[PDB]
């Protein structure tokens, strides 16, 4: 389908346990600016980013949400473009499990929060900017999806991004296609 232009890895921990690595493929030709923001926050380039932040909200059979590195509760985060930035486009959809999309507070309020779907979420199409998909590591996404949460859907054991970074792609490549 769309072409992967850059990859990003996250090493996750659930409570006191190293659980594995997730590798994302990002669609920099489709949504260049939303991809640049995510990659810059994964490398910590501009002095702030995702390393050591938590996934604050996970709901089984829906998605896992993270990226609030300032407040850690869903109300914070910021982008490399300022505190919030506009919706770039809605060309890609939440096609099935493993797609990565921007969380927001309505139209044009993207910051740093994102979610990874664990099911197709067609009701979010056209309202959230989709910009990448999990290439490797869907089984560690399912382990975070299954952690116990309290009644506010917050993990009882902290799910931490212990390390993260960019992996260069020399030739953009299409995802498995149909």
């Amino acid at each position: 389908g769309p072409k992967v232009t850059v990859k990003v890895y996250f090493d996750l921990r659930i409570g006191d346990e190293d659980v594995g690595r997730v590798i994302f493929g990002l669609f920099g030709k489709t949504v260049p600016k939303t991809v640049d923001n995510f990659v810059a926050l994964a490398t910590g380039e501009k002095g702030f980013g995702y390393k050591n932040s938590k996934f604050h909200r996970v709901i089984k059979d829906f998605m896992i949400q993270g990226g609030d590195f300032t407040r850690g509760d869903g109300t914070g985060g910021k982008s490399i473009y300022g505190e919030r930035f506009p919706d770039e486009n809605f060309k890609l959809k939440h096609y099935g499990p493993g797609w990565v999309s921007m969380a927001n507070a309505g139209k044009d309020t993207n910051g740093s929060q994102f979610f990874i779907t664990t099911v197709k979420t067609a009701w979010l199409d056209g309202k959230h900017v989709v910009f990448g998909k999990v290439l490797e590591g869907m089984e560690v996404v399912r382990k975070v999806e299954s952690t116990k949460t309290d009644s506010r859907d917050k993990p009882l054991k902290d799910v931490i991004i212990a390390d993260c970074g960019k992996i260069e792609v020399e030739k953009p490549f299409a995802i498995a296609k149909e």
């Binding site: 999309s101 969380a103 927001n104 507070a105």
Partner: peptide, 11 residues
Amino acid sequence: XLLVTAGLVLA
């Protein structure tokens, strides 16, 4: 319901 928002979490 099943939304993914940042600030006012809804049903």
